[PDB]
Amino acid sequence: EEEEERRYYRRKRLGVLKNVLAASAGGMLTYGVYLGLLQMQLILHYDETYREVKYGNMGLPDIDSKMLMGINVTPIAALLYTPVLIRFFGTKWMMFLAVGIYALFVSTNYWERYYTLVPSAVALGMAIVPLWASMGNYITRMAQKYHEYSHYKEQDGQGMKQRPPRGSHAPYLLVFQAIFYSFFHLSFACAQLPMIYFLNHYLYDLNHTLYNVQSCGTNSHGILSGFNKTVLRTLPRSGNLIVVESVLMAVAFLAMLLVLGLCGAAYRPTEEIDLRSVGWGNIFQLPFKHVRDYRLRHLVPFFIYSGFEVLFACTGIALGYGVCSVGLERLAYLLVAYSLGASAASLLGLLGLWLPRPVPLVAGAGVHLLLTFILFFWAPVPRVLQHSWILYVAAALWGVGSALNKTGLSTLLGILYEDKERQDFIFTIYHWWQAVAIFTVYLGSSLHMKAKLAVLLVTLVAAAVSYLRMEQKLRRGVAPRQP
Amino acid sequence: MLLVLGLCGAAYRPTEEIDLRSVGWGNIFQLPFKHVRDYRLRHLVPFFIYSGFEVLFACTGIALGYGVCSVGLER
Amino acid sequence: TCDAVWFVWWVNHTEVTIPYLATDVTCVGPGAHKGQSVISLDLYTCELDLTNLILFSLSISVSLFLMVMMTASHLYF
Ligand SMILES: *[C@@H]1O[C@H](CO)[C@@H](O[C@@H]2O[C@H](CO)[C@@H](O)[C@H](O)[C@H]2NC(C)=O)[C@H](O)[C@H]1NC(C)=O
Ligand SMILES: *[C@@H]1O[C@H](CO)[C@@H](O)[C@H](O)[C@H]1NC(C)=O
């Protein structure tokens, strides 16, 4: 009897595929609801009318600043407690804890007070890094399990009992990472649905809210230097706000429940008791001992640039250039165009599989670089509605570059390290450095310009990637050993 | 600065220098990070934090917090 | 402002002779609500009977309960 094992392995492969799909869907849904709520709060809490009639003597800007601080600073302390937490709960349970903390943060925006928003922001900043760490580790582990299942089904006795792939799981990991990043980028588009369906119809034209903007673009001198005091024409009824927040809470609840139920268990407690053979007095120092690795000293600038570029695409293009010609009427449209461009770039990078590994990466390092040039010389006049497709195509190309960069980084990190602990540590370091870059951009706000720093960082990243490639081809043969 | 430079001489003994160079540069950067596993540090670190807190509270908290009430910047 | 929301309601449904109710008694603020007449005012800004706190409390309780239940299920296998 051989058809029984065939059907068993096919069902296991289908289960792995649907688990990856459900994990990606839940991650993108919670990221989208979080981004939408954050954008709605940032737009609604920047006006004298709403702040003075709903709260007044409550310190709303102070609350917003404290929330931003607790979100952008706490990841630093989150690094110190993420390895033991991700290895104590598990690879999937960490995602559930993270989406639960995200739902808690979404719920804490109902009453909107200090003692309920500060701890929620602290928890969100504490869980933002372990969320991405567990997500990447789970994606890589499920891709490796898919590959070894397929290779054990097609090769029974030819496949070794230990270490099957030998670096042959790239076509099976890239296909999963492509759809994962496509969903993660469509999350940015889904985040703009509440603003379009409820917030885009309550703000007046740009003739009054974009009046004190004498110069923008290259002469930014800050995130938002010139801007009107109010932005809402009419005040939204509490019924609409409460119903849209209830819809957001319900969709976050659905995302969390689909993450919890449609994932099952892919941990194998044998791996748990094998990991417990290492101890707790060494796991706290393992990521600090992996600093002596040679590839990290050149991949860290790559991660810092990834964080810088994602935070510049989230704010620098929408609030720096897309706000000049058009006001807040077409900001969500610019974001959805960026999201569609990134989703197309996901499949574009998926198509580039026959070529070797470091082909699109440096290619990306050029394309958006060209955009940087366009972001350095060209400066759009704010008080004219002459050209609108230039911002659209710029956002599309920047999203393409960002998505291909992200998928190439993830594929490189998945193919460079294959051990479970190795992948966990690499993803933890990557996400810690991404959070550090986010915090640096947060501190780098209200500055003159951030394009020169961007081009310097991307040049250093291209140089470091070329150096790492040319030294890996010459067979350096260096790797740390900390079992 | 001149009395520190001149009235000190030299108490290094280059033999100790060449003995310290036998350790290397790729390990001295991690030695203080490896001494975290020491048992006495995990209990002496709060002592140091309190020392810093109390010296900065004596520099500012008593002069600019209590000594400024009754008398101004005269005393 | 909404600080005395029922005041904004009191001018809407009450039969008391108040002349010049739509052109003379105006609003000094705040911001976009300057020059507004008191009779043409309707402010749903302030939350009504405290159901927002009930909903928030229920949501955080459901979230923490699901978290605790799933952690206990993972601990108990
Ligand atoms: C924000 O926009 C409002 C208009 O929407 C500006 O108010 C105008 O101010 C000028 C300057 O004196 C007056 O001549 C206009 O009559 C005002 N318009 C009104 C009252 O509708 C306001 O100055 C802007 N503020 C900032 C900081 O840009
Ligand atoms: C309102 O904005 C439009 C945008 O094209 C402009 O054409 C029009 O002149 C503006 N109206 C003013 C400034 O009164």
Side-chain angles (χ1 to χ4, degrees):
Chain A
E1 307 184 23
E2 67 274 4
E3 293 85 10
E4 283 74 19
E5 291 279 312
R6 201 268 296 272
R7 277 187 289 267
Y8 180 81
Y9 276 171
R10 297 295 94 181
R11 280 167 290 182
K12 283 294 180 184
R13 192 187 75 160
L14 191 140
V16 165
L17 180 56
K18 64 100 174 179
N19 278 359
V20 170
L21 193 138
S24 59
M28 66 90 67
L29 199 41
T30 185
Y31 214 80
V33 71
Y34 149 75
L35 286 176
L37 188 51
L38 189 136
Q39 186 181 204
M40 188 175 64
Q41 293 310 311
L42 212 53
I43 298 299
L44 280 177
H45 293 311
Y46 184 62
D47 46 354
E48 291 81 17
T49 63
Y50 181 89
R51 181 195 303 108
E52 286 271 17
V53 302
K54 199 149 186 176
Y55 302 91
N57 314 335
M58 286 289 299
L60 207 54
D62 201 305
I63 289 179
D64 288 315
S65 300
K66 288 299 163 295
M67 188 170 61
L68 290 181
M69 182 263 297
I71 288 179
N72 298 21
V73 177
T74 44
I76 305 301
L79 176 65
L80 273 303
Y81 293 151
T82 179
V84 292
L85 201 59
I86 205 181
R87 294 163 79 100
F88 179 59
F89 281 155
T91 316
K92 177 212 64 177
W93 303 101
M94 182 52 58
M95 294 160 47
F96 182 83
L97 264 291
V99 301
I101 290 188
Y102 266 77
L104 158 65
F105 164 73
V106 171
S107 70
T108 49
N109 277 131
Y110 277 108
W111 196 240
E112 293 178 7
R113 271 195 177 179
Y114 189 86
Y115 61 92
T116 178
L117 276 184
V118 173
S120 67
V122 167
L124 188 68
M126 181 82 181
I128 182 178
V129 177
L131 167 60
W132 276 102
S134 53
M135 192 69 62
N137 188 271
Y138 181 80
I139 289 300
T140 308
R141 181 169 179 172
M142 294 297 280
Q144 285 188 349
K145 289 298 176 307
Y146 170 100
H147 175 273
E148 61 90 18
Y149 278 148
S150 183
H151 278 237
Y152 204 65
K153 180 52 196 179
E154 72 187 355
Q155 303 156 359
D156 302 1
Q158 274 63 57
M160 203 184 308
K161 298 181 179 180
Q162 212 281 319
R163 199 65 153 80
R166 309 305 314 270
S168 61
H169 63 92
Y172 283 165
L173 189 138
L174 194 139
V175 55
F176 292 158
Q177 210 76 29
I179 67 177
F180 168 73
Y181 273 114
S182 182
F183 283 168
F184 167 63
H185 294 110
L186 195 64
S187 181
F188 296 85
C190 183
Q192 313 308 313
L193 298 180
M195 180 183 179
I196 283 295
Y197 285 163
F198 158 75
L199 198 57
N200 197 25
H201 297 347
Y202 284 156
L203 56 93
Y204 49 91
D205 54 351
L206 59 88
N207 273 332
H208 299 343
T209 185
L210 267 295
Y211 183 75
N212 274 20
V213 190
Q214 307 91 349
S215 56
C216 71
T218 65
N219 310 85
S220 61
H221 298 68
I223 303 302
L224 283 176
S225 60
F227 208 64
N228 200 242
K229 63 160 187 179
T230 177
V231 288
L232 277 76
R233 163 179 41 87
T234 178
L235 191 149
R237 175 169 52 251
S238 63
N240 309 333
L241 193 63
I242 198 59
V243 77
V244 72
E245 212 179 339
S246 67
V247 163
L248 290 180
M249 170 53 59
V251 69
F253 187 85
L254 189 148
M256 174 174 60
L257 266 293
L258 68 90
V259 162
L260 165 71
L262 213 48
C263 194
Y267 195 49
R268 201 89 74 96
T270 67
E271 266 74 8
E272 162 70 24
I273 63 178
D274 288 352
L275 260 60
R276 297 280 75 79
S277 178
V278 184
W280 278 340
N282 192 29
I283 180 56
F284 188 80
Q285 304 89 317
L286 280 183
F288 291 95
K289 187 54 66 184
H290 291 88
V291 181
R292 80 171 192 177
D293 180 81
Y294 189 82
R295 295 148 293 184
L296 262 63
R297 281 182 285 268
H298 300 77
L299 285 179
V300 161
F302 196 29
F303 311 156
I304 299 182
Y305 165 69
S306 68
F308 265 71
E309 71 92 8
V310 72
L311 211 47
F312 185 80
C314 186
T315 61
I317 313 179
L319 279 79
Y321 288 87
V323 72
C324 293
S325 63
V326 69
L328 301 185
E329 296 89 1
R330 212 171 289 267
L331 189 149
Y333 295 100
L334 194 69
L335 290 183
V336 76
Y338 171 94
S339 307
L340 291 184
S343 182
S346 64
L347 306 183
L348 192 140
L350 168 65
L351 201 65
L353 185 58
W354 330 107
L355 275 298
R357 172 182 53 183
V359 174
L361 277 303
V362 57
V367 50
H368 46 59
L369 189 149
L370 312 180
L371 271 76
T372 305
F373 185 77
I374 305 148
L375 290 180
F376 184 75
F377 181 75
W378 152 77
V381 182
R383 312 303 293 113
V384 290
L385 197 55
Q386 179 67 31
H387 294 109
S388 180
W389 51 272
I390 46 172
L391 303 176
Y392 269 79
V393 68
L397 265 297
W398 195 276
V400 160
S402 65
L404 68 90
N405 188 1
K406 281 257 189 169
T407 187
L409 188 149
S410 286
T411 49
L412 189 149
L413 288 193
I415 198 56
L416 189 52
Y417 297 87
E418 285 169 289
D419 202 315
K420 296 96 176 183
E421 303 94 45
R422 284 296 200 274
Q423 294 159 172
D424 193 10
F425 301 152
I426 293 309
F427 289 146
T428 298
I429 292 298
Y430 164 65
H431 302 119
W432 163 57
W433 277 117
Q434 201 170 211
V436 165
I438 295 300
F439 169 71
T440 311
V441 179
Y442 168 73
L443 284 193
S445 60
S446 71
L447 286 183
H448 191 192
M449 271 305 302
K450 273 81 64 176
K452 226 161 188 173
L453 194 143
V455 66
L456 181 135
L457 263 292
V458 75
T459 300
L460 197 69
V461 168
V465 166
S466 301
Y467 193 62
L468 194 70
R469 187 266 185 190
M470 79 161 59
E471 271 175 334
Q472 280 278 357
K473 180 56 66 179
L474 285 172
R475 312 313 302 169
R476 281 299 162 267
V478 60
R481 286 185 170 182
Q482 295 87 15
Chain B
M1 174 174 60
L2 266 293
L3 68 90
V4 162
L5 165 71
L7 213 48
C8 194
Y12 195 49
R13 201 89 74 96
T15 67
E16 266 74 8
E17 162 70 24
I18 63 178
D19 288 351
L20 260 60
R21 297 280 75 79
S22 178
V23 184
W25 278 340
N27 192 29
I28 180 56
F29 188 80
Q30 304 89 317
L31 280 183
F33 291 95
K34 187 54 66 184
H35 291 88
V36 181
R37 80 171 192 177
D38 180 81
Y39 189 82
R40 295 148 293 184
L41 262 63
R42 281 182 285 268
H43 300 77
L44 285 179
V45 161
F47 196 29
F48 311 156
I49 300 182
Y50 165 69
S51 68
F53 265 71
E54 71 92 8
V55 72
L56 211 47
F57 185 80
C59 186
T60 61
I62 313 179
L64 279 79
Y66 288 87
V68 72
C69 293
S70 63
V71 69
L73 301 185
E74 296 89 1
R75 212 171 289 267
Chain C
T1 181
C2 191
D3 188 79
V5 60
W6 64 78
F7 186 33
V8 179
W9 159 85
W10 179 71
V11 196
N12 284 337
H13 302 274
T14 298
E15 276 296 329
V16 171
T17 54
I18 309 181
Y20 318 135
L21 201 50
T23 176
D24 287 331
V25 50
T26 177
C27 289
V28 75
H33 271 179
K34 290 178 62 179
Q36 289 276 86
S37 59
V38 192
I39 185 169
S40 65
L41 274 165
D42 175 58
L43 309 184
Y44 285 120
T45 317
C46 307
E47 297 91 351
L48 273 301
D49 54 353
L50 297 185
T51 175
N52 179 279
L53 174 68
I54 297 296
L55 192 151
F56 158 71
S57 122
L58 179 135
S59 194
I60 185 179
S61 303
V62 164
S63 78
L64 293 183
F65 201 67
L66 280 193
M67 186 268 299
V68 167
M69 180 179 184
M70 289 314 139
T71 47
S73 180
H74 172 62
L75 175 61
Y76 289 166
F77 294 90

